[PDB]
């Protein structure tokens, strides 16, 4: 959270495993694996995605692509509203930072790119 120091509130961050459709509302997402984030207390929070596996093969058009399907989903809802005292901006931004755990792995070197050395 990069907002003013004076701001406070709560955000609900929920993860819907692969298959589970984006939760209808906050409350239904509230029943799933979620985290209430009070940026009034902690300016940072880290969520862990238990698992993602690009292993299920797909031969659509005529071009075979080893695709996901494991599109796990991460939703974020305003648990409470944004609260601020006079003098502080009524908007703030947030930054997402990602990385993989130490249990990450990759297989099958496949050079592919849109950017190449021009003539």
């Amino acid at each position: 959270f990069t907002g003013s120091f004076m701001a406070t509130g709560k955000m609900l961050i929920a993860y819907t495993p692969p298959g589970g459709p984006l939760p209808k509302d906050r409350a239904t997402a509230m029943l799933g694996t979620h985290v209430i984030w009070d940026f009034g207390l902690q300016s940072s929070v880290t969520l862990v995605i238990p698992w993602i596996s690009n292993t299920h093969y797909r031969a659509h058009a005529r071009d075979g692509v080893f695709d996901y399907y494991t599109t796990g989903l991460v939703s974020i809802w305003y648990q409470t509203n944004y609260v601020v005292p006079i003098g502080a901006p009524n908007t703030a931004y947030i930054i997402a930072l990602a990385a993989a755990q130490k249990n990450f792995t990759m297989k099958l070197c496949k050079d592919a790119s849109d950017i190449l050395q021009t003539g």
């Binding site: 004076m6 406070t8 509130g9 709560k10 609900l12 906050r26 409350a27 509230m30 029943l31 799933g32 694996t33 979620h34 985290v35 209430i36 984030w37 009070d38 009034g40 207390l41 902690q42 929070v45 648990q79 409470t80 509203n81 944004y82 609260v83 601020v84 005292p85 006079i86 003098g87 502080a88």
Partner: protein
């Protein structure tokens, strides 16, 4: 500050403010030599017992106060509302947590207490001659709760000025924002109905009105998060 977790639920809360263990007792289970020692009552631990975070209510200058009923509030909600409904008997303790998020430029004081057998009494027509019984939307508001209309007498002909006689805790904006309360199972019987009887009701009223200068957020979100303790059920249907 630190965050505690119970399964798939993770709430960000302050270290450990003063908790109020109602009547000095801890929500415990019920031994084998009881009324139903045959139908061994299954006690949920897995998902059933975790952090539910109810639809935040917005504090306003004009707010009169709010109240929820138990176990009603949850019999609708998730896998706990699952057990409460398709089961014959129920006994359960509760950890209730209430928090506001306000700038050091807001002022207010919410009394937050729990009241066993909270029996609502309507106005009775006005002049006192109509024997009108409170509706079902007023007797068991669910997880949205319900607003008092006569806070001073707690919509039931009792001074609120004396509500402190119940497990209560204060939330004065200029000192704290989170209040916590542990509630044991309280009833004239070991077990009872989860859909017909509301052992108690959570009360939260503005004793000192919300206030602020023009420009500061006009509504203070109050977030109720609660978790079932040593909850038991018997006789599946």
């Amino acid at each position: 500050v630190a965050q505690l977790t119970i399964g798939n639920s993770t709430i960000t809360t302050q270290e450990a403010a003063n908790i109020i263990v109602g009547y000095g007792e801890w929500p415990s289970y019920c031994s084998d030599s009881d009324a139903t020692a045959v139908d061994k009552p299954t006690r949920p631990d897995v998902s059933v017992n975790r952090f539910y975070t109810l639809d935040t209510k917005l504090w306003e200058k004009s707010s009169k106060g709010w109240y929820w009923k138990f176990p009603d509030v949850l019999t609708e909600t998730g896998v706990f509302g699952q057990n409460a409904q398709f089961h014959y008997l129920y006994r359960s303790g509760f950890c209730i947590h209430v928090q506001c998020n306000a700038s050091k430029f807001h002022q207010g004081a919410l009394l937050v207490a729990v009241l066993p057998e909270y029996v609502i009494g309507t106005v009775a027509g006005g002049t006192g001659t109509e024997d009108t019984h409170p509706p079902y939307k007023q007797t068991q508001p669910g997880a949205d709760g319900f607003e008092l209309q006569h806070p001073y007498v707690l919509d039931a002909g009792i001074p609120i000025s004396q509500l402190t006689v119940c497990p209560h805790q204060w939330i004065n904006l200029r000192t704290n924002n989170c209040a916590t309360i542990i509630v044991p199972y309280i009833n004239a019987l070991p077990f009872d109905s989860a859909l017909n009887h509301c052992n108690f009701g959570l009360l939260v009223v503005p004793i000192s009105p919300l206030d602020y200068d023009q420009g500061a957020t006009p509504v203070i979100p109050i977030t109720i998060t609660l978790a079932p303790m040593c909850s038991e059920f018997a006789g599946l249907r």
